[PDB]
Fold L-2-keto-3-deoxyarabonate dehydratase.
Amino acid sequence: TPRHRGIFPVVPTTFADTGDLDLASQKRAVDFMIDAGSDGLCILANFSEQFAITDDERDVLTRTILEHVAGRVPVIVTTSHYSTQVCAARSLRAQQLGAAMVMAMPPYHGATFRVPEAQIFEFYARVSDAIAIPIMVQDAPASGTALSAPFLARMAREIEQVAYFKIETPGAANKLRELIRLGGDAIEGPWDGEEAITLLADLHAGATGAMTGGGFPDGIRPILEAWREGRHDDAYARYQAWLPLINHENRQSGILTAKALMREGGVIASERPRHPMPELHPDTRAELLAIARRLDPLVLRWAH
Amino acid sequence: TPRHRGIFPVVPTTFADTGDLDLASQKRAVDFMIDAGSDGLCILANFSEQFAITDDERDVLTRTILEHVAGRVPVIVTTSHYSTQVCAARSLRAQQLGAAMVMAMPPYHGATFRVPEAQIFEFYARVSDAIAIPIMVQDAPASGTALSAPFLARMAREIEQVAYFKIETPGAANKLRELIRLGGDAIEGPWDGEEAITLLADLHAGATGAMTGGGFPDGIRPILEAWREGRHDDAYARYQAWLPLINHENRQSGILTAKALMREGGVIASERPRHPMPELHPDTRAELLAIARRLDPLVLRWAH
């Protein structure tokens, strides 16, 4: 029924050791992620360190990644921006370059500038007016904005392109259940995130998709597949095996997790973030690799 | 002693009714603010709705405003950005275009992305290494980041260009007093903000400058002048007369205050913000103007 379902990991932005964009590694990261079995990819999201790049770099990354993917899997382009007109323009450009969907945080800035529901609704309505591809509404704490289940459901029922959701706030499972009940079939994509930390509970609640870290989508996808097949006990077993990795990414290594793993496996040239974001502490990184090695993920055995 | 002191109001960004940059009105706003007696100007700050414009617009605005100011008064260019290298590059560019100082929020993103003190120090140290003009560190709630007085004083003592500060967090007076005590003469510019709501207590604490709204710097400067003259009682009288206006800006009309005033006075063509930022409520605006008329500010009698 839905146009998209499954696992859509966030593509990290690859930098050279000195901070410059490293497009050669960027393409390899993309290729590994597709080889990992990803149903699709999400680019320029927070786990893509989008906050550390310029508009020019954003456009370069968008064109480069979309061209390299070459239509092999659908791509979700994050177009978040406070300005409605700017978000609309970036979303149109994404569509023109082949994007299958765009993701956008509700308009906001820092932890002081918020926008009333009425204007948020207009923000999405206007972005929707400008494009012909679906919009994924992101419900995450970074925005400091409250997007109730009723409001989200209302946008889905009244705004043409609003059809997908990335629920990353506390109690996502309960919210997803509410969103689906209130939105009905208007809720085409009730998805979760946070690197898949609450994946199993979210699937129970009706989630049909997950936006995770891009270091090991091959380890997470089977969980959604088993759930899809109606094998809940099998889902739990697979969920249990990988939970320590998921947990370490969520609470210890964070954003850099995928890049650290890709660097270890030779997928990318450098795992460094752009200053001032701190490097992974040594033990934190060592523990990450030790857990990953117990799981034999593709990222550590990608002969390309 | 300091290179700069007095009032440095934030220049609002003027848009056309449809959201496009209105450079003609932008120039008139700058001329009015200078005619109002501003000691200097600060551009592209949050009160300039910088979160609603693009990198390209940012550069257009910087060149347009600096050139129009034509060296009449010093200009502080806000160059905030999470990326150290990006901020450094924008700061160097601002300097080359004629900036007298740059203002930067500590690196952060949304309400979720923070940076350890250690990296914040390096962020500022590296921006300083790249330029030859002073840096104004902004201590504001929007960053959701903690910049203790001891840490701020340390940066001033150890980082060459870190010499100015805009303390906008609660209890600014106490912090300013502590910053000055710990920083000594390294604290060249202990300034406040928040449209001057706590100006009098801050001057008592040792503030030598104020970054206010750009709507009525002519009404605020006399307070700082009276204080410098050692006439505390006169400062109080002037403070008392304008406090209702300052207070209405701080809690009722906010960012759009300056633009609503300039528009009413014919200084600019449109007072509208960029969508999705909400327009001022009718009552809030009417009350704003009614208070302004009781004070006869220049913005309502600028014959140009």
Remarks:
- The two ends of chain A are 36 Å apart (CA to CA).
- The longest helix of chain A spans residues 232-253.
